[PDB]
From a paper:
Polycomb repressive complex 2 (PRC2) trimethylates histone H3 on K27 (H3K27me3) leading to gene silencing that is essential for embryonic development and maintenance of cell identity. The interaction of PRC2 with substrate nucleosomes involves mainly two structural elements within the catalytic subunit EZH2, the bridge helix and the CXC domain. A central mechanism of PRC2 activation is the recognition of PRC2-trimethylated lysine peptides by its EED subunit, resulting in conformational changes within PRC2 that lead to the allosteric activation of the complex. We discovered that H3K4me3-containing and H3K36me3-containing nucleosomes inhibit PRC2 using two distinct mechanisms because of the differences in their positions along the histone H3 tail.
Previous biochemical data showed that PRC2 can be activated on H3K4me3-modified nucleosome substrates in the presence of high local concentrations of allosteric activator (either excess H3K27me3 peptide or PRC2 complexes copurified with methylated JARID2). We, therefore, determined the structure of PRC2AJ1–450, thus including JARID2K116me3, bound to an H3K4me3-modified nucleosome at 3.5-Å resolution. In this structure, we observed an activated state of PRC2, with density consistent with JARID2K116me3 occupying the EED regulatory site, bent SBD and folded SRM. Importantly, we could not locate the histone H3K4me3 modification elsewhere in this reconstruction, supporting that JARID2K116me3 and H3K4me3 compete for the same binding site. Although the activated state was prevalent in our data, careful sorting for occupancy of the SRM led us to identify a second, rarer state (resolution limited to 8 Å) in which the SRM is unfolded and the SBD is extended, although the EED regulatory site remains occupied. These features correspond to a nonactivated state of PRC2, similar to that obtained for the PRC2AJ119–450–H3K4me3 structure. The existence of both allosterically activated and inactivated PRC2 states in the cryo-EM data agrees with previous biochemical observations concerning activity under conditions including allosteric activators and suggests that JARID2 and H3K4me3 are mutually exclusive binders of the EED regulatory site.
Numbering used by the authors:
A (entry chain A): 81 to 152, 156 to 167, 182 to 223, 228 to 254, 295 to 322, 351 to 362, 426 to 544, 556 to 682
B (entry chain I): 19 to 40
C (entry chain N): 4 to 93, 106 to 410
D (entry chain P): 170 to 295
E (entry chain B): 108 to 120, 138 to 166
F (entry chain L): 80 to 441
G (entry chain C): 17 to 181, 220 to 339, 426 to 746
The structure:
């Protein structure tokens, strides 16, 4: 028995949910505290009134207390650079990204530069000073995300303000390091101036046994289920690709798990897109027409109480893809219209009748041609009643009157009329009428 | 020959006519 | 390129998420309705009237809707809907024939960008068009069966603008007064209260040119007949008190958020509360008394926000919609309420609910009267949904 | 029906519904998860719900008083910013572990493009 | 015989039930499996 | 006339292979490249000097169980990229672009496995598919429309097995299990009008679907040549070559020796056999033979691994030639043989998933 | 026999000369090759094509499977990672077929002509099945017993050489060749060689067409022979695809006097208005030698058998002659003609037949004859009674069937059928046709509107849809049970016509053979029509063939009689709305029903 089967059987689903886990922890679909069987969550209550015309007042006083203090130019001198040439200093302003911007805009403006010594050493000094005014302005609080300082000779950076506009720099003598494109460094000074077990089945061919650790937490999504009832409900509803059974081992809990047989999960969008040629499928860049459908899924819940013992949606419209009768090709929504692709007169029959007629040898052309012409016309309309015949012949010469005259075969047509009258369908009152109408 | 018999789809049908009026 | 592969992976992840949500829906909603249209729509509005037949367990409501077809004819549509109107009733809930059916269709030139009905008369409806003008219609004057030829009577269209737009609002107290906002950066006011010579030509009574950028929204005041606000991409919200005779200088003007503003609305019950939503992924609010204090910020949306609406029948309920394929419902009474660590990691206390139905940008949504806790939503996938949130969440 | 029996619909062998997930996309997820785990170490350290960062000293600042603050930047270069820490606190925050729900919202998407996307990615209409 | 013969196409002719760690063992079977201990649950 | 076995390879999955196709579209001087399809894989190789063979690329399908059967090389007129197309038991046609290493088109519509694919010699956008559905289909791979369907009232009756184009690409021969051989025309005005329309069709311009052409009746047919299965046919100028399980190839022409091929009436009922070619131990079906581009040699595999080679020159078919190259390693079976555009090399595949190369020495 | 020994003897010469010819062929063929190939090469010289590059392992998959090829000779082994392919959606199985809207006659087949192929593993133990099928056909398969080949030329040469020294030779040839397999062909070839002459395209009694140059005067019967022998009255067609041609000709009685017969001046050359021909017309009850063409003479001969008394009309049709000339020619030619029978009928009785309850009495007699075992319905065939009445020896009477209008039964036969009379709709139980399941013929029921509105498409009768064929729109898609299925578009009420079930028609034993192969694959399309015929939809039919089986279906099938032909219709068992699938019970034996169809789609509700 190649166990790689078992592994490969259970390897595909797990990863999926694993990915979803990392997504769900950051991209929620619904609050788990609103779930009916997760009621222990959301410990708060709806009991509250909170009239609005006072909320501002609570804030109006609060803003008075919130204003603790505020900041009030800068000057800093660079000590000799150290290593195991003029310097460059830049001020970079980062602004908020807008609708037409793909990334946060940045504006690097230089405040100045100075000529620092080429790899000086301590005890050799016996000095360049940078002074910065209030380049930042209050109005910028609406446009600028932040500011930062950049240094080069060789690159280094630092940031002045936090998110809350809180200055992160004090005054003092700092030693820092820099990268290129321990090691190089510089110095400067600044001054402001129940046991649970799991069983895995593989159709009785093989099985695996494990024990849960940190029980009551979902082993896949790590959701904290405080009750066996809620845990079972969540496992059976969310992770639906598996099937679970409750065994109630005396140690406190035992669950046997197998792979779902069908799990009819499939694309639920426009059904036609499944058969679009690659490159056009999932275009999602233009309106598309499709047939109307209507479903219903929730009408009147019962809201029954919890019961551990229990643990041991119609459609309207077209809900499928339709194919052409002959070519077995998908049918477009517009092609579904009154065109019924079915009529009384197939062409292959029209060819077969003529080729079969041509087989006979004891017949001259003057009769074969008339027979074919009459048979095709008869099959065109499909007369079924004898009373129709009086009109039938009338219409016959009405359609082919030019052809027979061109063929010079009216004599055989008259002979056919005589034969028909012999069979009790035509009356003597109409035999001559066909010829009179011919000319 | 023709001992065997294939399974065909068959739809039975029967019907009388009437009783004369009395 | 790498974009195609990532899009392919995401198109499967979204389908898996939707499959999980549909499986888990029953224990979250008291009502779930879905219906697929042939062409998508960009409008959502519930008519005020309601009728309820005796001897049955459902009521009847009407919905207004637009159409944005690819190349074919465009239509303005109004449809009927049967909502269950019983507590014991539970065929799905009523008849077995059908719950939704179209009843009004009118030919249109171009797609429908916006459409709203006049409160003073539900029959009269406005319509924005891809052209540089506005149309007005009254469905009672046209047959339900559309004219096969195409275009028909515009029913007193308007004039004054130069580019297509989206702003549209009637004055609740004064009949005829209506405001529009378009890409021209201007706000145009007509008064159709009395136009003896319609002639399908009426020029804007007034034009305001405060904002320099493209104007995004405008809305009348809910109690005053001479107050409203203007919202543009300038990130500036401006308060315009008419009868001051100043088309350039407003009564007020401030910067709302760090990004372009998209939607604005007023609280029906309070006189001063104003709500606003912008592309900054933030929801803010203000008071007419003092405007230099951003009262509070709600931070849960992961992309642009395009619509905000105050809940009728409730004074402290509001909703937010955006391109995140999500819809949020917030609670103002639970601001800053202490909560358990698991409740905290679930989310902030003031957040009440999140819709998880649509699998694409939520084009539009709308509350309704005659029903306390139901909303209708429409997306670009030809998907329309009507739902009611579970009762146990509140009280 | 108004009130029918519990859901029940089965037969001997119904047609298989053609599952939608392909191996081509599954291998991409496998590789992405492997690289992310080797760059996050959540299953070994984070217990599947916490992300780890490793700090390193950046700048050595001395205050006018008897204090010396040191700047710290964390290796993963995640949404977190650099932080000043007193020298007395050194050797106590060499590595940090944080639950995923706390991380900054705006710059949490940097971990993976599949975390979230605007499917159109180029809007033709407004 | 020759007229009755059919026509052929082809020629004639685990003991340790350790923990949930098995999950962490199942997915990363290559490229430096972590925890250095999942090898026990082979 | 002499070849020597300079190289042999064996796969790992040890499942029989069925296809070999040299890229006959190579420009003057480019390296020789070919491909081979196995159980569910496709493999590419390039021929180096001194018998060296280099593995280039491989593709595999794992979504479902299938057995690939046949392949055909082509090119793109827009950018002149090599193109390949494959099919298998699932009845799915795939097109693969080796430049981008990605499948660009797939076609569905058949009901059972596909047996062969061939392209129009002149127009590169026409693809012919032969299936077990008693039907032959013609696709325009550019506009994605189906052109023609062959079969119906007077079509084949059991599992069409093979088909062949004429040298100028206006006539087709079809053979199947029902001992029947049929001719089909393409020159007819109706057919060419249908093709021209198929090259002009925009789905957004009309609400109608494309109207394909249905053909029910062959131009000529017969069943008297063989008393067993026929699974391979080849045009030779205006003569026809066919084989069967009767351990003999047969060459013939329709009608009498005085009957011109283009004057044959549909009701023709006589045939004129001209000659036969003899071999041994071909007691199974689904085995094929091959010819060089210049039409001067013929090669055919054998059940016990032997080879049979003849010349197409003035050598009388009664005693034209008898050439048998042999090796002692494999004797399972040989399905198909392949030549290059020139006659430099010959390639064969064994039933044990192995490849054999023979190099010509004049 | 030594027939082969002689065949080789001539073949020495025939192969010799033939050899030369084929060589002259080769040189010709090899020439054309040399041209065509060259042309192709020229085109190939006008192209530039990109080369392929070796596979490069993309970083997008750090862990993936790889394939390696072992070298039998002295070379190393290369390893390359595999590349995955995107998935595609398949569809269920199907086979070729053609559309149809009616039944189609098929002659019985006696030779297998092909041997199926199974999976090559099922027969490995059950090979006997092939031998049993062989015995079913009695060992006859095309190609078998060929013993070489014959072109019919060497056979003729041998027959000429095989002089007396006919019967044994013919038997030997038949045994050695399935193509001939009969001495009738040998004798036909013998006669052709002895005579080697043919009268022409026309039959042995040559009948050139009237509109041709080879005009020849002939009597009426030979002129109308082909028309009378080829036409089928039921479908009003020549060579009907669903009717055998074995029937009597148009030689039947008819009303002899159906004309005004009012004397008047036909014109200047009027047959009447002249004392000679004017009195001669009544008597038969100086001429001119006009150019009476043979075609015109035959025309006169045929036309005399249409009026027998009208020279004006006949001369009007025959423009060559004149009315007075027509009378003169009749006096010359018609004077030597044979007398006519001039029979007719009266049929006075109308009163007693009105009650018509005796018709129900005779229906009861027919039923009580074989009431218990009346399950055996029989195909209709027009009975012929030239002198005797429609007694117990009547083919229809013994057939237990009513006499259709095409029968030769007298116009007042008691075995005929009266027809419907209903007023609102001929659809309810009270209708007579609806009881004895039939469709109201449009020549009898003049009340229900069946006759009316034949061209228009709205009628009150609900028992005449099959003739008018107003089927409903149907869609095709994979079913939820097995393979394909049919879906309905629009809503429909209960007990309403859906469509027909068309296909080829074969004999019972013939259908039995095809059932054997259909059984092996557990799939079939055979439907029983009546006691003699079976309809197969495998090769022809319409969409309805795809309908699946169910034990509680919403449709049911009905076998009905229409214009003397059996048909099958499908009707709805309850109200049906858009998009639901259609089923009906196949009525198989329970054992076979379980063996073949064991899918219910639904578990036990209780």
């Amino acid at each position: 028995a190649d166990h790689e089967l078992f592994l490969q059987a259970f390897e595909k689903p797990t990863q999926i949910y694993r990915f979803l886990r990392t997504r769900n922890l950051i991209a929620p679909i619904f609050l788990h505290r609103t779930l009916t069987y997760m009621s222990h969550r959301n410990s708060r209550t709806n009991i509250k009134r909170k009239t609005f015309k006072v909320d501002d007042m609570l804030s109006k006083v609060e803003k008075m207390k919130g204003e603790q203090e505020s900041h009030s130019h800068l000057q800093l001198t660079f000590t000799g650079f150290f290593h195991k040439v003029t310097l460059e200093v830049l001020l970079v302003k980062v602004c908020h990204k807008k609708r037409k911007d793909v990334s946060c805009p940045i504006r690097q403006v230089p405040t100045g530069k100075k000529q620092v010594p080429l790899n000086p050493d301590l005890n050799q000094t016996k000095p360049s000073l940078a002074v910065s005014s209030n380049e930042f302005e209050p109005s910028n609080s609406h446009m600028v995300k932040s500011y930062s300082l950049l240094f080069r000779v060789f690159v280094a950076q630092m940031t002045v303000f936090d998110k809350n506009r809180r200055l992160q720099l004090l005054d003092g003598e700092y030693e820092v390091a820099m990268q290129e494109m321990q090691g190089p460094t510089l110095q400067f000074t600044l001054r402001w101036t129940l046991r649970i077990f799991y069983q895995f089945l593989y159709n009785n061919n093989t099985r695996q046994q494990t024990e849960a650790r940190d029980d009551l937490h979902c082993p896949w999504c790590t959701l904290n289920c405080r009750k066996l009832y809620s845990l079972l409900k969540h496992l059976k509803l969310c992770h639906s690709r598996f099937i679970f059974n409750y065994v109630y081992h005396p140690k406190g809990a035992r669950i046997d798990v197998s792979i779902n047989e069908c799990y009819d999960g499939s694309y639920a969008g426009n059904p036609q897109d499944i058969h679009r040629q690659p490159g056009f499928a999932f275009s999602r860049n233009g309106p598309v027409k499709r047939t109307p459908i209507t479903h219903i899924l929730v009408c009147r819940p019962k809201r029954t109480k919890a019961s551990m013992s229990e643990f041991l949606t119609y459609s309207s419209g077209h809900n499928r893809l339709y194919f052409h009768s002959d070519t077995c090709l998908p049918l477009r929504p517009q092609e579904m219209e009154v065109d019924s692709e079915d009529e009384k007169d197939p062409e292959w029959l029209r060819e077969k009748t003529i080729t079969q007629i041509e087989e006979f040898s004891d017949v001259n052309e003057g009769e074969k041609e008339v027979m074919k012409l009459w048979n095709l016309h008869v099959m065109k309309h499909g007369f079924i009643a004898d009373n129709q015949m009086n009109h039938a012949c009338m219409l016959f010469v009405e359609n082919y009157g030019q052809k027979i005259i061109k063929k010079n075969l009216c004599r055989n047509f008259m002979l056919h009329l005589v034969s028909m009258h012999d069979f009790n369908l035509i009356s003597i009152m109409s035999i001559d009428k066909a010829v009179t109408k011919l000319r | 020959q023709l001992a065997t018999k294939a399974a065909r789809k068959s739809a039975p049908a029967t019907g009388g006519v009437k009783k004369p009026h009395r | 390129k790498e974009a195609a592969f990532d899009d392919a992976v995401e198109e499967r992840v979204i389908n898996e998420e939707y499959k999980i949500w549909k499986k888990n829906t029953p224990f979250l909603y008291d009502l779930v309705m879905t219906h697929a249209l042939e062409w998508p729509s960009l409008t959502a509005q519930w008519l005020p009237d309601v009728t309820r037949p005796e001897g049955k367990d459902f009521s009847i409501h009407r919905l207004v809707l637009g159409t944005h077809t690819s190349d074919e004819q465009n239509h303005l549509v109004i449809a009927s809907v049967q909502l269950p109107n019983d507590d014991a009733q539970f065929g799905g809930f009523g008849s077995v024939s059908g719950k939704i059916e179209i009843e009004i269709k009118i030919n249109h030139e171009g797609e429908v960008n916006r459409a709203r009905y006049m409160p003073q008369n539900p029959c009269i409806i406005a319509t924005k068009t891809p052209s540089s003008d506005v149309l007005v219609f009254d469905y009672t004057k046209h047959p339900s069966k559309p004219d096969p030829s195409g275009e028909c009577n515009p029913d007193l269209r308007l004039r004054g603008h130069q580019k297509e737009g989206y702003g549209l609002s009637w004055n609740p107290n004064l009949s005829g007064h209506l405001l529009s906002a378009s890409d021209d950066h201007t706000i145009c006011l007509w008064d159709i209260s009395a136009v003896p010579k319609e002639g399908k030509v009426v020029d804007a009574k007034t034009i305001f040119t405060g904002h320099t950028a493209v104007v995004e929204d405008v809305s009348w005041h809910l109690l005053h007949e001479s107050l409203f606000g203007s919202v543009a991409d300038d990130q500036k919200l401006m308060i315009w008190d008419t009868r001051s005779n100043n088309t350039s200088k407003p009564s007020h003007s401030v910067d709302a958020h760090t990004a372009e503003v998209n939607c604005l609305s007023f609280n029906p019950y309070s006189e001063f509360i104003l709500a606003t939503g912008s592309a900054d992924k933030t929801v803010a609010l203000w008071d007419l008394r003092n405007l230099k204090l951003k009262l509070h910020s709600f931070e849960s949306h992961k992309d642009e926000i395009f619509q905000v609406q105050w809940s009728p029948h409730n004074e402290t309920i509001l909703a937010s919609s955006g391109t995140d394929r999500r819809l949020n419902v917030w609670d103002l009474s639970k601001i800053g309420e202490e909560q358990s660590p698991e409740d905290a990691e679930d989310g902030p206390p003031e957040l009440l609910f999140i819709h998880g139905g649509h699998t694409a940008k939520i084009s539009d949504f709308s509350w309704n009267p005659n029903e306390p806790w139901v909303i209708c939503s429409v997306s670009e996938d030809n998907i329309m949904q009507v739902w009611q949130m579970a009762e146990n969440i509140y009280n | 029906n108004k009130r029918r029996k519990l859901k029940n619909k089965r037969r001997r062998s119904l047609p298989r519904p053609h599952d939608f997930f392909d191996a081509q996309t599954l291998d991409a997820i496998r590789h992405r998860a492997i690289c992310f785990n080797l760059s996050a170490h959540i299953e070994s350290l984070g217990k599947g719900h916490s992300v780890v960062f490793h700090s390193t000293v950046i700048a050595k600042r001395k205050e006018d008083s008897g204090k010396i603050k040191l700047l710290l930047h964390w290796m993963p270069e995640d949404i977190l910013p650099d932080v000043w820490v007193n020298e007395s606190e050194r050797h106590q925050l060499k590595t940090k572990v944080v639950h995923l729900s706390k991380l900054p919202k705006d710059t949490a998407l940097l971990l993976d493009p599949n975390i979230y996307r605007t499917m159109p990615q180029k809007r033709l209409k407004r | 015989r020759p007229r009755l013969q059919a026509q052929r196409k082809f020629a004639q002719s685990p003991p340790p039930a350790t923990q949930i760690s098995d999950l962490s063992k199942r997915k990363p079977k290559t490229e430096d499996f972590l925890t250095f201990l999942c090898l026990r649950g082979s | 006339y002499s070849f020597k076995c300079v190289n042999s390879l064996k796969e790992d999955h040890n499942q029989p292979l069925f296809g070999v196709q040299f890229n006959w579209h190579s420009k003057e001087g480019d390296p020789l490249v070919f491909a081979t399809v196995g159980s569910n894989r496709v493999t590419l190789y390039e021929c180096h000097s001194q018998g060296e063979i280099r593995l280039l690329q491989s593709y595999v399908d794992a979504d479902a169980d299938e057995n690939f059967y046949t392949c055909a090389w082509t090119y793109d007129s827009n950018t002149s990229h090599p193109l390949l197309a494959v099919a298998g038991s699932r009845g799915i046609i795939r097109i693969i672009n080796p430049i981008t290493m990605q499948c660009i088109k797939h076609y569905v519509g058949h009901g059972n496995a596909i047996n062969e694919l061939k392209f129009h010699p002149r127009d590169p956008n026409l693809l012919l598919s032969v299936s077990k559905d008693h039907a032959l289909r013609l696709w325009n791979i550019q506009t994605d429309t189906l052109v023609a369907i062959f079969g119906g009232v007077e079509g084949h009756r059991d599992e069409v097995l093979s088909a062949d184009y004429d040298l100028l690409g206006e006539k087709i021969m079809s053979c199947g299990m029902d001992h029947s051989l049929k001719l089909w025309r393409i020159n007819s005005k109706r057919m060419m009008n249908a093709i021209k329309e198929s090259y002009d069709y925009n789905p957004n311009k009309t609400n109608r679907p494309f109207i394909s052409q249905k053909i029910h009746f062959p131009d000529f047919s017969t069943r008297d040549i063989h008393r067993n299965y026929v699974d391979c046919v080849r045009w030779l100028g205006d003569l026809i070559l066919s084989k069967s399980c009767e351990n003999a190839i047969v060459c013939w022409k329709p009608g009498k020796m005085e009957d011109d091929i283009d004057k044959i009436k549909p009701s023709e009922s006589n045939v004129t056999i001209l000659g036969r070619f003899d071999y041994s131990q071909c007691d199974i079906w689904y085995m094929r033979f091959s010819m060089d581009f210049w039409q001067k040699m013929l090669a055919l595999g054998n059940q016990v691994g032997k080879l049979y080679v003849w010349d197409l020159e003035v050598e009388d078919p009664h005693k034209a030639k008898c050439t048998t190259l042999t090796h002692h390693k494999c004797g399972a079976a040989i399905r198909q043989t392949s030549f290059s555009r020139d006659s430099s090399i010959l390639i064969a595949v064994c039933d044990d998933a192995s490849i054999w190369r023979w190099d010509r020495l004049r | 026999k030594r027939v082969k020994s002689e065949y080789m003897r001539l073949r020495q010469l025939k192969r010799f000369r033939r050899a030369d010819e084929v060589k002259s062929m080769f040189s010709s063929n090899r020439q054309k090759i040399l041209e065509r190939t060259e042309i192709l090469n020229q085109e190939w010289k006008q192209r530039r094509i990109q080369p392929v590059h070796i596979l490069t392992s993309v970083s997008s998959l750090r862990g993936t499977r790889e394939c390696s090829v072992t070298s039998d000779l002295d070379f190393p082994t290369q390893v390359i990672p595999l590349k995955t392919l995107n998935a595609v959606a398949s569809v269920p199985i199907m086979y070729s077929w053609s559309p149809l809207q009616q039944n189609f006659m098929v002659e019985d087949e006696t030779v297998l002509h092909n041997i199926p192929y199974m999976g090559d593993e099922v027969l490995d133990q059950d090979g006997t099945f092939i031998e049993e099928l062989i015995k079913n056909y009695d060992g006859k398969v095309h190609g078998d017993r060929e013993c070489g080949f014959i072109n019919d030329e060497i056979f003729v040469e041998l027959v000429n050489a095989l002089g007396q020294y006919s019967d044994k030779i013919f038997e030997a040839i038949s045994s050695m060749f399935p193509d001939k397999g009969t001495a009738e062909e040998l004798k036909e070839k013998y006669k052709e060689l002895t005579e080697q002459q043919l009268p022409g395209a026309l039959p042995p009694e040559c009948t050139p067409n009237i509109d041709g140059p080879n005009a020849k005067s002939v009597q009426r019967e030979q002129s109308l022979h082909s028309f009378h022998t080829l036409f089928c009255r039921r479908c009003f067609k020549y060579d009907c695809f669903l009717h055998p041609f074995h029937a009597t000709p148009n030689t039947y009685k008819r009303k002899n006097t159906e004309t005004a017969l009012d004397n008047k001046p036909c014109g200047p050359q009027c047959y009447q208005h002249l004392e000679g021909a004017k009195e001669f017309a009544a008597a038969l009850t100086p001429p001119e030698n006009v150019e009476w063409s043979g075609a015109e003479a035959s025309m006169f001969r045929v036309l005399i058998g249409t009026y027998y008394d009208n020279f004006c009309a006949i001369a009007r049709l025959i423009g060559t002659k004149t009315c007075r000339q027509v009378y003169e020619f009749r006096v010359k030619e018609s004077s030597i003609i044979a007398p006519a029978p001039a029979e007719d009928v009266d049929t006075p009785p109308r009163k007693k037949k009105r009650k018509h309850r005796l018709w129900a009495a005779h229906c009861r007699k027919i039923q009580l004859k074989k009431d218990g075992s009346s399950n055996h319905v029989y195909n209709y065939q027009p009975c012929d009674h030239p002198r005797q009445p429609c007694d117990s020896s009547c083919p229809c009477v013994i057939a237990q069937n009513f006499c259709e209008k095409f029968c030769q039964c007298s116009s007042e036969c008691q075995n005929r059928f009266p027809g419907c009379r209903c007023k609102a709709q001929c659809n309810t139980k009270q209708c007579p046709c609806y009881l004895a399941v039939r469709e109201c013929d449009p020549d009898l029921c003049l009340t229900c509107g069946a006759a009316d509105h034949w061209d228009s498409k709205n009628v009150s009768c609900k028992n005449c849809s099959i003739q008018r064929g107003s089927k409903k729109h149907l869609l095709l898609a994979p079913s939820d049970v097995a393979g394909w299925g049919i879906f309905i578009k629009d809503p429909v009420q209960k007990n309403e016509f859906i469509s027909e079930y068309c296909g080829e028609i074969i004999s019972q034993d013939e259908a039995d053979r095809r059932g054997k192969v259909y059984d092996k694959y557990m799939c079939s399309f055979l439907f029983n029509l009546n006691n003699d015929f079976v309809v197969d939809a495998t090769r022809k039919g319409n969409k309805i063939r795809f309908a699946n089986h169910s034990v509680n279906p919403n449709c049911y099938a009905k076998v009905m009689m229409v214009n003397g032909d059996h048909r099958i219709g499908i009707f709805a068992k309850r109200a049906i709305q858009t998009g639901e699938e259609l089923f009906f019970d196949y009525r198989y034996s329970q054992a076979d029903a379980l063996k073949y169809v064991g899918i219910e789609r639904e578990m036990e509700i209780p």
